[PDB]
Amino acid sequence: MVQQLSLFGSIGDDGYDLLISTLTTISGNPPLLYNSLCTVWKPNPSYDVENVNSRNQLVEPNRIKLSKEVPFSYLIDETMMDKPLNFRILKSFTNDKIPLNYAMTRNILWSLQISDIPAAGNNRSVSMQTIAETIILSSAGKNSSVSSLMNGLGYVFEFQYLTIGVKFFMKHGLILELQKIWQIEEAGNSQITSGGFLLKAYINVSRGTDIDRINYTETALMNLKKELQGYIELSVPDRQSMDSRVAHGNILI
Amino acid sequence: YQIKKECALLISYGVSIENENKVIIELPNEKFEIELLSLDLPKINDKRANLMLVMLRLLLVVIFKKTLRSRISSPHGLINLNVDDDILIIRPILGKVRFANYKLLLKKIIKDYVLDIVPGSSITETEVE
Amino acid sequence: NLPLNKPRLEKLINEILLKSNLSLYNFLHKYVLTLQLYMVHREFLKLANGGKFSKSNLIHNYDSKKSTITVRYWLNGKMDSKGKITIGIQRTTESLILKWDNQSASRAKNMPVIYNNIVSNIEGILDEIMFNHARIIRSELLARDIFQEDEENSDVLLFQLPTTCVSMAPIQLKIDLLSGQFYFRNPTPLLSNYASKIN
Amino acid sequence: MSNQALYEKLEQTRTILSVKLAELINMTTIADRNDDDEGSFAQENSELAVATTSVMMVNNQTMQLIKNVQDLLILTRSIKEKWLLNQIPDEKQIEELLDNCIETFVAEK
Amino acid sequence: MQPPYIQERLKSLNDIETQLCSMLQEASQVTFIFGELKRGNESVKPQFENHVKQFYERLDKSTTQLRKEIQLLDENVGTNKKALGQDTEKMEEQLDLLSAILDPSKSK
Amino acid sequence: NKLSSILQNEHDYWNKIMQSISNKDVIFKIRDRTSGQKLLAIKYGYEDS
């Protein structure tokens, strides 16, 4: 469980290369390639959860995220082994098509994660969100599989998507991510972040009670934002967009 | 500076510091002196000293590369070098020399107590990775 | 060559003499002693950054109101003693003196406890105090007759230990001149463990 | 920023042109003009203050020309400085090398 | 050495201030000639037109070229890093020295 | 005349500076502690390595 303090933004791919150089001028570090695959699961509507205390609202149903890393050998087509595995490959990832299709992901079926809507009030300068996390290491039995496990808990699959981007590690534990997101269905693959990169700068705090640390984290994030003034505008997203409860449906992408 | 901080923990094995610019290493048959000096006949072991300097520089470069790799790997990890673990400069050279000395001593002991006593013994030397 | 404030000194001395009933000499002596103490503290600060005693061997605390310096050494020493030194103005001679506050040094014979010329040879005085404390501890150990005397080395103690059933051999234990922990020449893991226990 | 420098050089150039025309007309008609017609407007009423106004013109044109040229030169150097500063931009062989080095040291030690 | 683009940029700038110096010099000669023209000798009258024309054409195109340079500044935007490899190159050279030490036939 | 003589003098020093300086290197302007003016400085340490 962490308090994640975050700021968001977006950029057009035209400046992409330039942006990268500037980051290396500041951090002093080179970018590192990465990828991931997230699957979202929701409580089964076939089961009537009368246990939701309607007269008191002790709790509301929520959605579970399962993440995993996928090797690049599934994301590189027959035209791309010649180039080395570095960040420049992202320049060729502008098409809505991608080597990883629905059948391979179905064949695949980790990190389990749950979150809450950010803290209310208009006196917050950065998006503060609470995250509860655990890890699944292995399994066994006659039906050892992620799908069977989540159906045993009482959850069913809803959708999935694939993230590819680069990471920058700066001082004080600040992490800056440049991402491209591909939604995947049997109908096909569609790039929601079409013609651009999604930028997200964030820090993690282990204990929410410590307030000196939280103040330091906010100071670092606002200093970073004030450093990038004039190039990219980093902003607090909409509090109602980062809500992932089942009752109301929307997805920040 | 790294040599000073590393050798400050090797007093128990016969390594001492003379001043702010000199360190001394003693061996049952040899002596090594490392000095930082201001500018103000080819002997047998001159190449030996040049090689020692070269490998010391190489080990410092290796330390720098390890530091950079650890820094890039993860942001949270505070980069505070541990003298017992990270600083490895005189340890490999001293270990090689003393291991050679002990290998010679055990060779002599085995020859005296086994080879000279029991004829026909066959000895094979190997290194295991 | 010090940049003295000549005019301010002129007015100060003139005012003192006008209000004088002696006092000027006392003020001058006090200022000289304070300046000497301050520059001694500055020398300590310069040395501590790169000195042999940097790693917690020596700690110095300076008080301007009492104009005295307390020096604590060998923090990891529990042999019924605590290494303490006091630098301060002597009442009888009105001079800055260094006293090694130790009862063992108090009853020790033919061994000076108070030293002068601290500015010139502070390092030499510290080395002499270190060696004297080590010698006092070694002499106490010899008086207890646990370690035999080493003729070749006066700072090495011989402990008799049987390596085998018939062998009866001495082991050389030495005293660190910086922090003062006993150590063996080639300690085995058990020997190292018991040396740490001794420490 | 750069647009401000553009504008500043603009008044720099127009001021050069205007002061040039002013000193030209002043020195050309420095010979005072007497015309009986009322249309002409040239007055020299107090004799020596005429020379004072003349040296006025001289000092003004000198100071303004020198200042403008020096400002332009400093501007060019600043541009060049901005140009310079602001524009942000086998293993196996080593294995046998170290093996030979270590065996040579072991033999020589 | 610097990349060539900066080299011709600095060459153009140097040409700019040399042209400014030439403009100042020509201002000096035109001020000189106007004095004797006011004195009353008409022989150097034809030279006056040439001097004025060259002075004005030197004043104009210099500012034009400087304007072009400042314009180049407009589109040139968007178009310790060495440390990231610095240790590496140091590493390389050190081993090279070892090679020179390792081979006694090359130490001559 | 004075302006031309002085000005060509600083072009002489200017050309000396331009053709004397080589280049990758971390170069910036710093304010001297004693002088207070802007001077060119180069970072050559291993701090970032």
Side-chain angles (χ1 to χ4, degrees), chain D residues 28-43:
Chain D
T28 49
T29 188
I30 211 73
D32 285 326
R33 285 306 149 206
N34 58 347
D35 291 327
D36 301 2
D37 59 355
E38 301 182 7
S40 68
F41 286 120
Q43 185 62 253

Side-chain angles (χ1 to χ4, degrees), chain E residues 32-89:
Chain E
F32 182 76
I33 190 167
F34 186 80
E36 81 257 15
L37 294 174
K38 197 51 184 180
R39 285 328 195 201
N41 48 1
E42 321 315 339
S43 62
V44 285
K45 180 175 184 177
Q47 301 302 111
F48 182 76
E49 288 103 331
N50 189 358
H51 288 86
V52 172
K53 198 167 190 175
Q54 294 191 34
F55 173 82
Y56 272 91
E57 68 90 25
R58 199 82 39 78
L59 170 64
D60 306 331
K61 57 183 192 301
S62 65
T63 66
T64 291
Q65 184 57 79
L66 183 63
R67 183 67 148 80
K68 279 175 184 180
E69 283 300 322
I70 308 179
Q71 287 295 141
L72 283 164
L73 294 174
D74 300 331
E75 322 86 350
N76 270 262
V77 56
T79 44
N80 195 329
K81 183 177 288 293
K82 177 180 167 63
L84 274 75
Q86 181 172 358
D87 67 332
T88 288
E89 61 86 20

